[PDB]
Amino acid sequence: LDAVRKRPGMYIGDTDDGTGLHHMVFEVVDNAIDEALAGHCKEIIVTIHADNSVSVQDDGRGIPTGIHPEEGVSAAEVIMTVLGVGVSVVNALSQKLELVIQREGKIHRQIYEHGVPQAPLAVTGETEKTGTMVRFWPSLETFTNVTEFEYEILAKRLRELSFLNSGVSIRLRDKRDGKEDHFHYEGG
Amino acid sequence: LDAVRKRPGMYIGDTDDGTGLHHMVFEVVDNAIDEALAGHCKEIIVTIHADNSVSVQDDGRGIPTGIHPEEGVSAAEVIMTVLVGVSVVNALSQKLELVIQREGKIHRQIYEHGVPQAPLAVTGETEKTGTMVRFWPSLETFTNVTEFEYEILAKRLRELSFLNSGVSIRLRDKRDGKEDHFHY
Ligand SMILES: Nc1nc2ccccc2[nH]1
Ligand SMILES: Oc1ccccc1Cl
Ligand SMILES: Oc1ccccc1Cl
């Protein structure tokens, strides 16, 4: 990840005007949609939290959790720490990132700070559901000037995406003012 | 450097009891001595600053500044960013200032958590030669014991002065004005 940290603008875009900031959300959304479109009648939920973090949930299969034979860490950690631009770029430029994977009847949790895992991916409990949740806090050391998520930039993009992803339910939630949208195109 | 950031304790030592914190200084000093023991009447100055940073100055030849043919960046940057070594210290420092005097030129570079902020750059002229590294330990890594104890540094630098007989070692505390000069 040091290549991304050295020149953030090359990977995410302009880190001052707010375009790069919103590309962080859209990069995570692209991966969640990729997963959701591969399943049956899946759903993604994008939530803007009151602390200006954004979470993206899907109810797909979950990011693989088994140990990568070569790397010697969970497949999820390899995806988060090895260099669409990739979710690893979002991880590298986030001061905090929370990963929650529900898979094979088990809840897996891991926390990152500036791309560095604070502990190995850990099975913390049990679940009947499946899916992946990524919540990230953009790094205020990288993202300057424009540091808050505009609802309409996310809402407009998710509406456009809905028509290219048939059968995928897309929900947007703003916990700052309670505003919410539901985009669900069922064509084809 | 992510391997170091992931498990700081395995590279520098215990990051809670003050052991690792002081090892950060000793790692930089090892390189400075190494350098300086390849020459003759060299001196190393270790300074504890009021803002809880430590600087190590030497009057050696200076770390090589030219572009590394394989890596495509300055040889100094390769030393600070590739794998114990000063790269470990760089990785676990929230800020690190590098100043190299070599071949008639002063070179400067700043790092934050091991990430270079710009390329090694010529900032002026000089008759002198040497290397200076000033680092601010990351308080995200180093907990409980965050401030440098003078006597922990003094003890180790004394031991080093006997082993490295030709090298002068000065220790300076800018918080309370305390100082020592170890030379065998
Ligand atoms: N605050 C902060 N910024 C960082 C950048 C890279 C790795 C660790 C870091 N901690
Ligand atoms: O399904 C997910 C969700 C977020 C990031 C990456 C993946 Cl694969
Ligand atoms: O002489 C040197 C060399 C490497 C790191 C620090 C110093 Cl002071």
XYZ file of all heavy atoms in Angstrom, chain A residues 50-147, unseen atoms left out:
729
model
N -23.473 9.896 11.069
C -23.372 11.236 11.671
C -21.938 11.696 11.963
O -21.693 12.896 12.101
C -24.212 11.306 12.939
N -21.001 10.747 12.053
C -19.570 11.052 12.205
C -18.813 11.167 10.862
O -17.581 11.103 10.837
C -18.904 10.013 13.130
C -18.943 8.588 12.571
O -19.691 8.313 11.605
O -18.223 7.731 13.118
N -19.552 11.357 9.764
C -19.012 11.407 8.396
C -18.137 10.201 7.995
O -17.139 10.341 7.284
C -18.337 12.769 8.117
C -19.273 13.751 7.425
O -19.712 13.517 6.295
N -19.583 14.855 8.096
N -18.540 9.018 8.458
C -18.110 7.754 7.871
C -19.238 7.273 6.970
O -20.379 7.734 7.093
C -17.809 6.716 8.955
O -18.936 6.463 9.772
N -18.909 6.364 6.056
C -19.896 5.734 5.180
C -19.733 4.223 5.279
O -18.615 3.715 5.187
C -19.740 6.200 3.713
C -20.555 5.333 2.752
C -20.155 7.659 3.579
N -20.851 3.522 5.473
C -20.875 2.066 5.447
C -21.584 1.576 4.191
O -22.556 2.182 3.745
C -21.552 1.504 6.699
O -22.918 1.869 6.756
N -21.073 0.487 3.626
C -21.695 -0.184 2.492
C -21.887 -1.643 2.891
O -20.910 -2.336 3.174
C -20.819 -0.084 1.229
C -21.481 -0.787 0.044
C -20.526 1.378 0.906
N -23.145 -2.086 2.932
C -23.501 -3.467 3.268
C -24.021 -4.138 2.013
O -24.668 -3.490 1.198
C -24.626 -3.534 4.312
C -24.635 -2.450 5.377
C -25.828 -2.554 6.312
O -26.264 -3.650 6.669
N -26.358 -1.406 6.719
N -23.732 -5.426 1.861
C -24.467 -6.278 0.928
C -24.818 -7.586 1.622
O -24.185 -7.951 2.615
C -23.687 -6.512 -0.378
C -22.402 -7.308 -0.180
O -22.480 -8.526 0.083
O -21.311 -6.721 -0.328
N -25.824 -8.279 1.094
C -26.224 -9.593 1.612
C -25.767 -10.736 0.688
O -26.438 -11.768 0.575
C -27.741 -9.639 1.881
C -28.583 -9.422 0.632
O -28.045 -8.975 -0.405
O -29.799 -9.692 0.696
N -24.609 -10.556 0.052
C -24.041 -11.563 -0.834
C -23.368 -12.694 -0.078
O -23.664 -12.940 1.090
N -22.444 -13.369 -0.751
C -21.791 -14.562 -0.207
C -20.763 -14.259 0.892
O -20.413 -15.151 1.665
C -21.115 -15.349 -1.334
C -22.071 -15.862 -2.407
C -21.323 -16.280 -3.663
N -20.660 -15.142 -4.302
C -19.784 -15.225 -5.305
N -19.443 -16.403 -5.832
N -19.240 -14.111 -5.794
N -20.283 -13.016 0.954
C -19.228 -12.628 1.886
C -17.869 -12.757 1.224
O -17.647 -13.681 0.436
N -16.955 -11.839 1.540
C -15.576 -11.925 1.036
C -14.969 -13.215 1.608
O -15.211 -13.527 2.774
C -14.719 -10.696 1.443
C -15.249 -9.426 0.768
C -13.254 -10.886 1.051
C -14.538 -8.148 1.174
N -14.206 -13.978 0.792
C -13.560 -15.183 1.331
C -12.701 -14.895 2.565
O -12.017 -13.871 2.613
C -12.695 -15.673 0.163
C -13.395 -15.173 -1.050
C -13.979 -13.845 -0.661
N -12.770 -15.787 3.551
C -12.125 -15.591 4.854
C -10.960 -16.542 5.151
O -10.187 -16.282 6.074
C -13.159 -15.727 5.987
O -13.747 -17.033 5.945
C -14.256 -14.680 5.836
N -10.828 -17.630 4.388
C -9.757 -18.606 4.602
C -8.372 -18.034 4.363
O -8.216 -17.058 3.625
N -7.368 -18.652 4.982
C -5.990 -18.158 4.921
C -5.431 -18.388 3.516
O -5.543 -19.485 2.974
C -5.061 -18.838 5.965
C -5.579 -18.637 7.401
C -3.627 -18.326 5.840
C -5.654 -17.197 7.870
N -4.848 -17.338 2.939
C -4.204 -17.408 1.629
C -2.888 -18.180 1.805
O -2.045 -17.753 2.595
C -3.941 -15.995 1.098
C -3.600 -15.941 -0.360
N -2.417 -16.432 -0.868
C -4.278 -15.430 -1.414
C -2.386 -16.238 -2.174
N -3.503 -15.631 -2.531
N -2.719 -19.328 1.102
C -1.523 -20.174 1.293
C -0.173 -19.454 1.182
O 0.719 -19.704 1.994
C -1.654 -21.221 0.180
C -3.115 -21.327 -0.061
C -3.675 -19.952 0.165
N -0.034 -18.581 0.185
C 1.197 -17.811 -0.027
C 1.380 -16.684 0.992
O 2.421 -16.593 1.646
C 1.218 -17.221 -1.440
N 0.361 -15.838 1.125
C 0.447 -14.621 1.945
C 0.404 -14.909 3.448
O 0.935 -14.131 4.241
C -0.674 -13.635 1.584
C -0.725 -13.207 0.120
C 0.517 -12.458 -0.327
O 0.880 -11.456 0.324
O 1.128 -12.871 -1.336
N -0.237 -16.012 3.833
C -0.321 -16.421 5.235
C -1.268 -15.600 6.097
O -1.153 -15.612 7.323
N -2.199 -14.891 5.459
C -3.254 -14.144 6.154
C -4.577 -14.432 5.451
O -4.585 -14.986 4.347
C -2.982 -12.619 6.179
C -1.644 -12.321 6.846
C -3.035 -12.007 4.778
N -5.688 -14.041 6.076
C -7.020 -14.260 5.492
C -7.116 -13.666 4.087
O -6.535 -12.611 3.819
C -8.116 -13.653 6.373
O -8.071 -12.235 6.354
N -7.847 -14.345 3.204
C -8.096 -13.842 1.845
C -8.687 -12.427 1.863
O -8.347 -11.600 1.015
C -9.008 -14.792 1.081
N -9.546 -12.153 2.847
C -10.092 -10.808 3.060
C -8.998 -9.765 3.297
O -9.037 -8.691 2.697
C -11.081 -10.809 4.217
N -8.022 -10.081 4.149
C -6.903 -9.163 4.407
C -6.030 -8.933 3.173
O -5.556 -7.817 2.957
C -6.041 -9.628 5.589
C -4.951 -8.632 5.976
C -4.196 -8.995 7.242
O -4.829 -9.414 8.234
O -2.956 -8.830 7.252
N -5.829 -9.975 2.368
C -5.083 -9.843 1.111
C -5.795 -8.841 0.196
O -5.161 -7.936 -0.345
C -4.898 -11.209 0.397
C -4.278 -11.031 -0.990
C -4.038 -12.139 1.246
N -7.110 -8.993 0.057
C -7.930 -8.073 -0.743
C -7.846 -6.632 -0.207
O -7.774 -5.686 -0.991
C -9.401 -8.567 -0.833
C -9.474 -9.838 -1.696
C -10.329 -7.496 -1.407
C -10.713 -10.677 -1.471
N -7.839 -6.478 1.118
C -7.771 -5.156 1.756
C -6.378 -4.502 1.760
O -6.291 -3.282 1.891
C -8.289 -5.235 3.203
C -9.757 -5.627 3.349
S -10.965 -4.497 2.622
C -10.565 -2.985 3.468
N -5.306 -5.290 1.632
C -3.926 -4.778 1.780
C -2.990 -4.935 0.561
O -1.846 -4.471 0.615
C -3.234 -5.427 2.999
O -3.147 -6.846 2.809
C -4.004 -5.127 4.281
N -3.460 -5.571 -0.517
C -2.662 -5.765 -1.739
C -3.278 -4.967 -2.892
O -4.498 -4.964 -3.080
C -2.541 -7.262 -2.112
C -1.750 -7.447 -3.407
C -1.883 -8.031 -0.972
N -2.416 -4.308 -3.665
C -2.836 -3.353 -4.692
C -3.324 -4.045 -5.965
O -2.826 -5.107 -6.340
C -1.669 -2.412 -5.013
C -1.892 -1.186 -5.902
C -3.140 -0.411 -5.505
C -0.662 -0.290 -5.840
N -11.564 -0.842 -12.192
C -11.623 -0.326 -10.829
C -10.259 -0.268 -10.166
O -9.336 -0.982 -10.563
N -10.145 0.584 -9.147
C -8.874 0.808 -8.430
C -8.636 -0.163 -7.259
O -7.511 -0.259 -6.759
C -8.725 2.281 -7.946
C -8.911 3.249 -9.112
C -9.683 2.631 -6.806
N -9.683 -0.874 -6.834
C -9.614 -1.805 -5.704
C -10.004 -1.177 -4.374
O -9.749 0.006 -4.135
N -10.624 -1.982 -3.509
C -10.974 -1.564 -2.143
C -9.738 -1.310 -1.261
O -9.823 -0.577 -0.274
C -11.921 -2.591 -1.459
C -11.189 -3.881 -1.096
C -12.598 -1.986 -0.232
N -8.602 -1.917 -1.614
C -7.328 -1.665 -0.925
C -6.903 -0.188 -0.937
O -6.287 0.286 0.018
C -6.213 -2.531 -1.522
O -5.981 -2.221 -2.885
N -7.238 0.528 -2.011
C -6.969 1.970 -2.106
C -7.817 2.739 -1.085
O -7.321 3.658 -0.431
C -7.218 2.507 -3.540
C -7.117 4.030 -3.594
C -6.234 1.876 -4.519
N -9.084 2.348 -0.950
C -9.997 2.959 0.022
C -9.485 2.727 1.446
O -9.484 3.644 2.269
C -11.445 2.418 -0.128
C -12.357 2.951 0.976
C -12.004 2.771 -1.504
N -9.037 1.502 1.708
C -8.455 1.118 2.994
C -7.215 1.947 3.330
O -7.101 2.474 4.435
C -8.088 -0.373 2.965
C -7.736 -0.940 4.336
O -7.002 -1.921 4.426
N -8.263 -0.342 5.402
N -6.303 2.062 2.363
C -5.058 2.829 2.528
C -5.293 4.300 2.880
O -4.569 4.861 3.705
C -4.207 2.726 1.268
N -6.309 4.908 2.264
C -6.630 6.329 2.477
C -7.751 6.577 3.503
O -8.311 7.677 3.553
C -6.980 6.985 1.136
C -5.983 6.797 -0.014
C -6.472 7.537 -1.249
C -4.581 7.257 0.366
N -8.069 5.571 4.320
C -9.032 5.709 5.408
C -8.307 5.620 6.743
O -7.579 4.659 6.989
C -10.085 4.604 5.327
O -10.856 4.723 4.147
N -8.510 6.616 7.605
C -7.931 6.594 8.960
C -8.480 5.450 9.826
O -7.802 4.987 10.746
C -8.085 7.953 9.664
C -9.512 8.390 9.975
C -9.589 9.827 10.463
O -9.021 10.737 9.854
N -10.302 10.039 11.565
N -9.703 5.010 9.528
C -10.267 3.795 10.108
C -11.131 3.072 9.073
O -11.803 3.714 8.265
C -11.096 4.133 11.349
C -11.669 2.931 12.086
C -12.189 3.323 13.463
C -13.218 2.331 13.985
N -13.695 2.674 15.353
N -11.086 1.741 9.095
C -11.980 0.911 8.284
C -12.400 -0.327 9.076
O -11.553 -1.043 9.609
C -11.316 0.513 6.962
C -12.220 -0.173 5.919
C -11.798 0.193 4.499
C -12.268 -1.692 6.088
N -13.711 -0.554 9.146
C -14.300 -1.695 9.839
C -14.819 -2.672 8.794
O -15.595 -2.288 7.917
C -15.458 -1.223 10.724
C -16.183 -2.325 11.493
C -17.351 -1.809 12.320
O -17.669 -0.601 12.239
O -17.959 -2.621 13.052
N -14.384 -3.925 8.898
C -14.796 -4.995 7.995
C -15.583 -6.033 8.789
O -15.109 -6.511 9.820
C -13.560 -5.639 7.363
C -13.758 -6.789 6.370
C -14.515 -6.325 5.135
C -12.403 -7.368 5.984
N -16.784 -6.363 8.314
C -17.617 -7.406 8.922
C -18.125 -8.335 7.817
O -18.872 -7.903 6.936
C -18.805 -6.815 9.716
C -19.657 -7.925 10.333
C -18.306 -5.853 10.790
N -17.700 -9.599 7.870
C -18.053 -10.609 6.870
C -18.884 -11.704 7.534
O -18.440 -12.318 8.509
C -16.796 -11.246 6.236
C -15.948 -10.182 5.525
C -17.183 -12.356 5.262
C -14.509 -10.591 5.299
N -20.084 -11.938 7.005
C -20.947 -13.025 7.455
C -20.921 -14.116 6.391
O -21.276 -13.875 5.236
C -22.365 -12.515 7.692
C -22.438 -11.433 8.761
C -23.849 -10.941 9.000
O -24.696 -11.676 9.505
N -24.105 -9.687 8.647
N -20.477 -15.310 6.783
C -20.159 -16.380 5.834
C -20.005 -17.714 6.569
O -19.418 -17.759 7.651
C -18.855 -16.033 5.107
C -18.451 -16.970 3.985
C -17.173 -16.469 3.334
N -16.642 -17.412 2.352
C -17.062 -17.545 1.091
N -18.052 -16.795 0.599
N -16.482 -18.449 0.305
N -20.540 -18.786 5.979
C -20.464 -20.146 6.548
C -20.944 -20.228 8.011
O -20.364 -20.940 8.836
C -19.041 -20.707 6.397
C -18.612 -20.919 4.950
C -17.117 -21.141 4.800
O -16.501 -21.734 5.711
O -16.555 -20.726 3.764
N -22.010 -19.488 8.313
C -22.582 -19.440 9.656
C -21.762 -18.723 10.721
O -22.021 -18.903 11.913
N -20.796 -17.901 10.302
C -19.855 -17.241 11.213
C -19.717 -15.750 10.894
O -19.662 -15.367 9.724
C -18.482 -17.912 11.115
C -18.420 -19.300 11.736
C -17.223 -20.087 11.229
C -17.054 -21.389 11.997
N -16.131 -22.334 11.307
N -19.664 -14.926 11.943
C -19.393 -13.491 11.830
C -17.887 -13.295 11.965
O -17.300 -13.737 12.951
C -20.085 -12.670 12.945
C -21.606 -12.865 12.904
C -19.725 -11.186 12.819
C -22.317 -12.400 14.159
N -17.283 -12.623 10.984
C -15.855 -12.302 10.993
C -15.695 -10.789 11.101
O -16.352 -10.050 10.369
C -15.175 -12.782 9.709
C -15.448 -14.213 9.369
N -16.660 -14.641 8.871
C -14.658 -15.311 9.427
C -16.610 -15.943 8.655
N -15.406 -16.374 8.985
N -14.813 -10.336 11.994
C -14.584 -8.906 12.220
C -13.104 -8.552 12.127
O -12.244 -9.323 12.561
C -15.128 -8.492 13.589
C -16.637 -8.609 13.702
C -17.147 -8.096 15.039
N -18.602 -8.222 15.139
C -19.499 -7.353 14.660
N -19.130 -6.240 14.023
N -20.798 -7.603 14.824
N -12.821 -7.386 11.550
C -11.460 -6.851 11.490
C -11.482 -5.331 11.368
O -12.344 -4.769 10.684
C -10.692 -7.451 10.313
C -9.182 -7.257 10.400
C -8.434 -7.942 9.270
O -8.983 -8.158 8.189
N -7.172 -8.285 9.515
N -10.520 -4.689 12.029
C -10.379 -3.236 12.036
C -9.033 -2.872 11.414
O -8.016 -3.502 11.713
C -10.430 -2.664 13.475
C -11.719 -3.093 14.198
C -10.272 -1.141 13.467
C -13.008 -2.653 13.535
N -9.048 -1.858 10.552
C -7.842 -1.290 9.958
C -7.741 0.182 10.333
O -8.757 0.835 10.575
C -7.885 -1.399 8.435
C -7.872 -2.810 7.896
C -9.042 -3.570 7.846
C -6.696 -3.379 7.409
C -9.036 -4.864 7.344
C -6.680 -4.671 6.904
C -7.850 -5.408 6.873
O -7.834 -6.686 6.371
N -6.512 0.691 10.376
C -6.255 2.126 10.493
C -5.156 2.512 9.511
O -4.036 1.999 9.604
C -5.839 2.494 11.915
C -6.924 2.276 12.957
C -6.502 2.697 14.358
O -5.519 3.455 14.503
O -7.161 2.267 15.324
N -5.485 3.398 8.565
C -4.577 3.795 7.474
C -4.024 2.589 6.694
O -2.855 2.567 6.305
C -3.452 4.692 8.012
C -3.949 5.949 8.654
N -4.233 7.089 7.934
C -4.229 6.241 9.946
C -4.657 8.033 8.756
N -4.665 7.544 9.983
N -4.882 1.589 6.480
C -4.513 0.367 5.761
C -3.850 -0.733 6.576
O -3.632 -1.827 6.054
N -3.541 -0.459 7.845
C -2.838 -1.400 8.713
C -3.861 -2.169 9.552
O -4.614 -1.551 10.307
C -1.865 -0.668 9.667
C -1.087 -1.667 10.522
C -0.917 0.230 8.877
N -3.884 -3.516 9.440
C -4.803 -4.285 10.287
C -4.392 -4.222 11.758
O -3.209 -4.370 12.068
C -4.675 -5.714 9.748
C -3.326 -5.772 9.129
C -3.015 -4.391 8.629
N -5.359 -3.986 12.641
C -5.096 -3.902 14.083
C -5.010 -5.281 14.736
O -4.375 -5.438 15.781
C -6.161 -3.040 14.770
C -6.253 -1.621 14.219
C -4.928 -0.882 14.267
O -4.306 -0.625 13.234
N -4.475 -0.564 15.470
N -5.663 -6.264 14.122
C -5.508 -7.672 14.484
C -5.883 -8.538 13.280
O -6.457 -8.029 12.312
C -6.390 -8.011 15.674
N -5.559 -9.844 13.323
C -6.038 -10.739 12.264
C -7.561 -10.851 12.226
O -8.218 -10.673 13.258
C -5.412 -12.091 12.634
C -4.206 -11.739 13.433
C -4.610 -10.528 14.223
N -8.105 -11.132 11.043
C -9.537 -11.404 10.882
C -9.958 -12.476 11.886
O -9.367 -13.557 11.923
C -9.842 -11.878 9.458
C -11.313 -12.116 9.089
C -12.071 -10.802 9.011
C -11.411 -12.868 7.771
N -10.964 -12.162 12.699
C -11.361 -13.010 13.820
C -12.832 -13.401 13.725
O -13.680 -12.551 13.457
C -11.097 -12.288 15.131
N -13.126 -14.684 13.951
C -14.508 -15.154 14.081
C -14.996 -14.764 15.476
O -14.478 -15.255 16.484
C -14.638 -16.680 13.843
C -15.992 -17.215 14.311
C -14.443 -16.991 12.369
N -15.976 -13.865 15.520
C -16.488 -13.317 16.778
C -17.850 -13.878 17.199
O -18.256 -13.701 18.346
C -16.592 -11.785 16.687
O -17.461 -11.425 15.607
C -15.215 -11.171 16.453
N -18.560 -14.540 16.290
C -19.884 -15.060 16.612
C -20.515 -15.891 15.520
O -19.832 -16.359 14.605
N -21.833 -16.045 15.618
C -22.613 -16.891 14.715
C -23.704 -16.078 14.033
O -24.142 -15.050 14.553
C -23.236 -18.061 15.483
C -24.295 -17.664 16.502
C -24.686 -18.811 17.400
O -25.317 -19.764 16.896
O -24.360 -18.755 18.605
N -24.154 -16.568 12.883
C -25.171 -15.884 12.087
C -25.837 -16.842 11.102
O -25.216 -17.799 10.653
C -24.563 -14.685 11.316
O -25.580 -14.036 10.542
C -23.422 -15.126 10.388
N -27.105 -16.578 10.789
C -27.815 -17.267 9.704
C -27.639 -16.544 8.362
O -27.782 -17.161 7.304
C -29.307 -17.383 10.034
N -27.326 -15.247 8.413
C -27.198 -14.409 7.217
C -25.811 -14.506 6.588
O -24.869 -15.023 7.195
C -27.499 -12.946 7.564
C -28.912 -12.702 8.070
C -29.042 -11.333 8.718
C -30.453 -11.097 9.231
N -30.558 -9.810 9.971
N -25.709 -14.006 5.359
C -24.432 -13.876 4.657
C -24.281 -12.450 4.139
O -25.276 -11.767 3.897
C -24.331 -14.854 3.470
O -25.343 -14.548 2.501
C -24.491 -16.294 3.937
N -23.037 -12.007 3.965
C -22.764 -10.682 3.417
C -21.450 -10.059 3.838
O -20.682 -10.645 4.603
N -21.209 -8.858 3.320
C -20.011 -8.075 3.625
C -20.423 -6.651 3.955
O -21.207 -6.041 3.221
C -19.043 -8.037 2.428
O -18.642 -9.368 2.093
C -17.801 -7.209 2.751
N -19.884 -6.134 5.056
C -20.054 -4.742 5.444
C -18.669 -4.107 5.547
O -17.794 -4.627 6.245
C -20.791 -4.653 6.781
C -21.311 -3.266 7.137
S -20.087 -2.057 7.690
C -19.264 -2.919 9.026
N -18.482 -2.998 4.832
C -17.285 -2.163 4.939
C -17.744 -0.777 5.373
O -18.563 -0.156 4.693
C -16.530 -2.072 3.596
C -15.398 -1.045 3.659
C -15.986 -3.441 3.204
N -17.236 -0.314 6.515
C -17.445 1.057 6.975
C -16.095 1.737 7.077
O -15.194 1.206 7.723
C -18.142 1.072 8.331
C -18.456 2.465 8.849
C -19.312 2.384 10.097
N -19.490 3.692 10.721
C -20.187 3.914 11.833
N -20.789 2.910 12.471
N -20.280 5.150 12.314
N -15.958 2.908 6.457
C -14.683 3.618 6.436
C -14.816 5.088 6.826
O -15.823 5.738 6.529
C -13.994 3.470 5.072
C -14.687 4.187 3.945
C -14.267 5.454 3.545
C -15.744 3.588 3.268
C -14.900 6.115 2.503
C -16.381 4.245 2.225
C -15.958 5.509 1.840
N -13.773 5.577 7.493
C -13.634 6.961 7.909
C -12.514 7.523 7.035
O -11.358 7.121 7.205
C -13.221 7.036 9.382
C -14.308 6.718 10.369
C -14.969 7.612 11.163
C -14.842 5.424 10.691
N -15.889 6.960 11.944
C -15.832 5.618 11.678
C -14.587 4.121 10.238
C -16.570 4.558 12.222
C -15.322 3.065 10.780
C -16.301 3.294 11.763
N -12.844 8.418 6.076
C -11.803 8.996 5.213
C -10.701 9.684 6.017
O -10.997 10.355 7.007
C -12.567 10.030 4.378
C -13.976 9.563 4.384
C -14.185 8.915 5.718
N -9.449 9.496 5.603
C -8.318 10.112 6.293
C -8.324 11.621 6.072
O -8.232 12.084 4.937
C -6.988 9.535 5.807
O -5.900 10.211 6.415
N -8.411 12.372 7.166
C -8.352 13.835 7.116
C -6.925 14.359 6.876
O -6.742 15.552 6.627
C -8.943 14.438 8.397
C -10.394 14.050 8.722
C -10.825 14.665 10.047
C -11.348 14.459 7.607
N -5.926 13.478 6.964
C -4.559 13.784 6.526
C -4.424 13.792 4.996
O -3.574 14.505 4.459
C -3.567 12.775 7.114
C -3.486 12.787 8.636
C -2.601 11.685 9.194
O -1.955 10.961 8.406
O -2.554 11.544 10.435
N -5.239 12.986 4.311
C -5.251 12.914 2.844
C -6.316 13.837 2.253
O -6.018 14.655 1.378
C -5.496 11.464 2.363
O -4.370 10.656 2.718
C -5.702 11.387 0.840
N -7.551 13.685 2.727
C -8.689 14.429 2.188
C -8.861 15.766 2.901
O -9.288 15.818 4.057
C -9.960 13.580 2.258
C -9.894 12.359 1.389
C -9.607 11.108 1.932
C -10.072 12.467 0.014
C -9.526 9.985 1.119
C -9.992 11.349 -0.803
C -9.719 10.107 -0.250
N -8.507 16.835 2.190
C -8.546 18.198 2.708
C -9.620 19.012 2.000
O -10.179 18.574 0.988
C -7.186 18.892 2.510
O -6.818 18.850 1.124
C -6.111 18.200 3.336
N -9.902 20.191 2.552
C -10.838 21.170 1.982
C -12.296 20.671 1.989
O -13.100 21.161 2.786
C -10.365 21.629 0.587
C -11.143 22.819 0.055
O -11.645 23.650 0.815
N -11.234 22.914 -1.266
N -12.630 19.709 1.125
C -13.954 19.068 1.123
C -13.833 17.711 1.824
O -13.221 16.784 1.283
C -14.505 18.883 -0.311
C -15.901 18.263 -0.282
C -14.525 20.214 -1.051
N -14.406 17.613 3.026
C -14.293 16.417 3.878
C -15.635 15.802 4.320
O -15.638 14.857 5.113
C -13.468 16.737 5.145
O -14.177 17.679 5.960
C -12.108 17.312 4.772
